[PDB]
């Protein structure tokens, strides 16, 4: 397979900005590159083919350029409708392969997350399997790091994160980190803490509870 590499993975921008996105291939593909726009839950749409040909109906602020192994998508004077994920794709040879995408998201002011920790309810404990939830609410930018600590010790594994799309009104993100343990393991420790690091925080914030208090 011809490897297709996009950069950056994500970029924050504002309406009126000019943005450029890079696509590079592992071997030459001449000008056989397509660009697609995808919005959540919607069908992808073709923007550009043969590296620089604008698909019919697509606004002229979209332009593609490049050849060989190095390609660029330029969006002039970005508009609200352009916040989306963009994919490039080579088709010099089978199989046609896609880059993993560049998400273009809405820039806004830095906002620290509000952090909350939720001890498992008594009926979780009865079930024999418990999930501790840590909530990071209404923050920007997206990048955030959650450490679980159990009796002061770093707990790796058994956690999963989930994040919302950028809020339609305030353009922030919210995120959950869920730690799932057997009740036997859960009962074998006393203090549970999630530690959150984020650009908005001058120092990590730690929320904790003592099990059974």
């Amino acid at each position: 397979d011809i490897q297709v590499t996009q950069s950056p993975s994500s970029l924050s921008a504002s309406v009126g900005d000019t943005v450029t996105i890079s696509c590079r291939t592992s071997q030459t593909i001449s000008t056989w590159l397509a660009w697609y726009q995808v919005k959540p839950g919607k069908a992808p749409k073709l923007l550009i083919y043969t590296a620089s040909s604008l698909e019919s109906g697509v606004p002229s602020r979209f332009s593609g350029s490049g050849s060989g192994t190095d390609f660029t998508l330029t969006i002039s004077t970005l508009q609200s409708e352009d916040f989306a994920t963009y994919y490039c794709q080579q088709y010099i040879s089978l199989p046609p392969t896609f880059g993993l995408g560049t998400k273009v998201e809405i820039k806004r002011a830095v906002a620290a997350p509000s952090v909350f920790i939720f001890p498992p309810s008594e009926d979780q404990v009865k079930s024999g399997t418990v999930s501790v939830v840590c909530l990071l609410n209404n923050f920007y930018p997206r990048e955030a790091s959650v450490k679980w600590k159990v009796d002061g010790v770093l707990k790796t594994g058994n956690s999963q994160e989930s994040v919302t799309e950028q809020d339609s009104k305030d353009n922030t993100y919210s995120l959950s980190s869920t730690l799932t343990l057997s009740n036997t393991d859960y009962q074998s420790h006393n203090v549970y803490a999630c530690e959150v690091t984020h650009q908005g925080l001058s120092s990590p914030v730690t929320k904790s509870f003592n099990r059974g208090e």
Partner: peptide, 23 residues
Amino acid sequence: GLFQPNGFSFTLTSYWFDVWGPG
């Protein structure tokens, strides 16, 4: 899937995709 001649030769490109269904 659309494709093009890669020639001056019998070689074809592979496909790009100008219409997609909802999925």
